[model samples]
Target: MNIFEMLRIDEGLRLKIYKDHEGYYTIGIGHLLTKSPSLNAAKSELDKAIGRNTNGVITKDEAEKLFNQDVDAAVRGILRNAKLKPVYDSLDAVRRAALINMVFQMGETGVAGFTNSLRMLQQKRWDEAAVNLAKSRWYNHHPNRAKRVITTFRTGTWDAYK
Candidate 1:
């Protein structure tokens, strides 16, 4: 069984973490952020941020306007993708769920996007990324959620998962 089976969420339910409707773009679930913009717009922006060719990028300015609706859709789509789940290893369930929120906002990558965050994880800078995660606007607005992610990160284990 997966040590963190608790993180085996029910697909799209990860959207409850972070959400916004009046920013340049919607970002975060709990304390994780994407970028500022429309729903799929974040995905497009992510591709560009990471220097990849995708459907195209979204405007941060536009995302700020329709923050709520677009963000919700973006967050939901991310949760259902299995490819993203493995990265949840070091984090607790909430933080794991929060990751989807962050990616959906940023893209399949994430702020600092996949290039940076994943690199950080691969380098085993677990605590460092947790610090960066806290500094995010998503962290600022969602203290409880931030604590949850940070806790799992600092603990080096997923305690109280699920």
Candidate 2:
């Protein structure tokens, strides 16, 4: 499956607003309401997408739209990083999706902080990259998600999605 399908499963779709693992206000396929351009703007988009004044509720179609936007933003965030672009381009689609998934969860800035891991990934050192990923707070906070991501990196396969 594609990155969007993989993320839909990993992120878990929700029709109603809820606090995320880190307590940010989130909705609709891991869209962080707090990180939107503005609260009012986000609310307006939500209302428009759902076609009603919202009490933090979204339809499946609206959720899918937000998911697409968020995934595109994640991809753009990675591509815009000079250091990440070459490494990203060198990888296969599954591995690329793994990186995008990481960016989706943590943002490009956060992913860029993994200097050692990125270096390993750049050199095609899959085991080293996976090891480096496992040593982070991100792994500690969400071992299950991190494991799947790291496995995708190490194996360069879509087994994680299965």
Q: Write the per-residue lDDT of candidate 1 for residues 42-138, one digit (tens) a residue.
A: 6554454435543433344433333444455555555554545445554455555546445543465454344455555545587776776677666
- Residue 33 C-alpha lDDT in model 1: 35
Task: Please give, for residues 42-106, the per-residue lDDT of candidate 2 as tens digits.
Answer: 57666765678986788888889888888999999999998778889999888999999999998
TM-scores for the candidates: 0.38, 0.89
**What is residue 133's positional error in candidate 1, in angstroms?**
1.4
Q: Model 2: which residue pairs collide?
A: none
Whole-model lDDT per candidate = 0.47, 0.86
- Model 2: per-residue Cα lDDT at residue 108: 88
